[PDB]
Amino acid sequence: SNQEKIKKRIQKLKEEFATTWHKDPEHPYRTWTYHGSYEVKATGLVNGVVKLMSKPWDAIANVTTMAMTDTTPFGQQRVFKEKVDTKAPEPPAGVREVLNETTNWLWAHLSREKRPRLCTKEEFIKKVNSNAALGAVFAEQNQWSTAREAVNDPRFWEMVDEERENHLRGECHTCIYNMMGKREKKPGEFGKAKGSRAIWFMWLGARYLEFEALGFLNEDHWLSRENSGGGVEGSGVQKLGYILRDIAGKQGGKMYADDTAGWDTRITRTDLENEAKVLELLDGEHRMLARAIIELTYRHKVVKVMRPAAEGKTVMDVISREDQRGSGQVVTYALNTFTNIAVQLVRLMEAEGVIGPQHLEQLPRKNKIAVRTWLFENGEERVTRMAISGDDCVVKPLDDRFATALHFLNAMSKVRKDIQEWKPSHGWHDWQQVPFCSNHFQEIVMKDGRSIVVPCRGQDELIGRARISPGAGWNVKDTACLAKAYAQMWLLLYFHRRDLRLMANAICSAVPVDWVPTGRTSWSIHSKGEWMTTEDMLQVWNRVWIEENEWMMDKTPIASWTDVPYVGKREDIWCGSLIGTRSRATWAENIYAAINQVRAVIGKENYVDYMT
Ligand SMILES: Nc1nc2c(ncn2[C@@H]2O[C@H](COP(=O)(O)OP(=O)(O)OP(=O)(O)O)[C@@H](O)[C@H]2O)c(=O)[nH]1
Ligand SMILES: [Zn+2]
Ligand SMILES: [Zn+2]
């Protein structure tokens, strides 16, 4: 019967590629049913402006060696084997009973005020025509070039409608996963560095349907701090410091921020079941559509991934399994956030003595009671002791027993990264040490007495990323506008870093004052892009850090950059600054040559001297 639910998708595939379809180089797959293969053409970039404005960093390996993705069949195969051909064991009965109660409570709290609703075509279109259906990677719309043209084409919507009737009928024909490649390991301190991950694509239509049925969780902000207490969905990275500093303001133990080692490979069928409880919030047609997404696309999956063969030849494998995620779903972040809140609530209950190692296998009735009673009595408060964004977590428990509350965690397969399995976690007394969404956060004193909580992250990573140009069809102009997007990002979020302040200015001096930044500087749901503008960045800085800063009680505007603070030198150096260095001194002193060489490549335009 699993065979039954993937039939139509396999069949559509054997048909379309009946030509080259064969069954089996001796395939690698261990935990995925293998159906067959066919021949395909395989699949498989420096920002001159940024490069030119950052000569010292030519000498830094973290920067020069940086690559984002590996789209080759080789990389597809490696990431699949290391992160997808894997199976997390299901938690024991006692643990299942605890997650059951815990997720019942969380669903009821998240739906206390908000009502589910279908998302719409015109809504999807609105989303597509802008700054993307980000992360939920689109790119299969190949009867059209782009998503913009596809959603404008009446025939596209007929495709959607047709599959929509199949779902309303209980079948999926087109909703198929394609593993495009691997996002490379990202940098970070032991226990926070992100491992490699899979990049999933689906037909644009399968994304619409998913978005129609379940997108409400994102569009109506179910995981906003206001709705969920623990979540931070909707906030920009510039808000997260402040939220952490508020959590730190509460009475309790040290602050914890344990990562799970490969969170997406560690979601269980139990977790999916508890997530699938959304269905019970929906009615009529809405629930029918959602039930199909959950059952036919989330649960009975079909996957295409490339593999190297024979004579510099590559095949596409077709495989299936009843599974869960890795992302590639419209609601991956929202459901990761949900499950992670649940996970942390269970950890807190162990830390607080409500449940023990004795309860893993079987949950005594008395304990079932104490669980429901604790959630009811405490859930609303404990949730505010958390900052949860996807698999990222920060939690401040009542006391440091939390450090040893590990039995339920490990039994849930939510094994922590880079620490021995039963070694107590490390917590920090100082909230400014705590890592969260690739940053930490520092409180700094501005010249005028007032203070701000700003985000800091390894500077090499930032320069490295700005140096990368995604283009092939990125212009001189597009290249300069991308460089400008990065520079202005740094001015809004990392102005407190000397080298970046200096490098943002020089980039901005070097690109026409009237060119609008384009492209994207971050994939993070927390990267809001107030820097995608031609508005003077001081004004934008004032708006973010003073005017709209709800932790800023005095609204007195900052008047010049010379009044906008830097971290202390010690910090700047800790996070990768090159100040106090011969090459960076030389660089600061010759900058103008680089700025001029850029103005002279781009040519005669309106420029502005921001180095004053
Ligand atoms: N578990 C999981 N997390 C993801 C996935 N995609 C993005 N993220 C999260 O998004 C956060 C931001 O980093 P990425 O999305 O990897 O890349 P990025 O955000 O463009 O890089 P930054 O500008 O440093 O934030 C990461 O810390 C991830 O935890 C995913 O598919 N699965
Ligand atoms: Zn389908
Ligand atoms: Zn720092």
Automatic annotation (TrEMBL):
Residues 253-405 form the RdRp catalytic domain. Zn(2+) 1 binds at E163, H167, C172, C175. Zn(2+) 2 binds at H440, C456, C575. It is found in: Host cell surface; Host cytoplasm, Host perinuclear region; Host endoplasmic reticulum membrane; Host nucleus. Homodimer; in the endoplasmic reticulum and Golgi. Interacts with protein prM. Interacts with non-structural protein 1. Interacts with host HSPA5. Acts as a chaperone for envelope protein E during intracellular virion assembly by masking and inactivating envelope protein E fusion peptide. prM is the only viral peptide matured by host furin in the trans-Golgi network probably to avoid catastrophic activation of the viral fusion activity in acidic GolGi compartment prior to virion release. prM-E cleavage is inefficient, and many virions are only partially matured. These uncleaved prM would play a role in immune evasion. This is Genome polyprotein. It comes from Japanese encephalitis virus (JEV). The chain holds residues 2801 to 3416 of 3432 of the full protein.
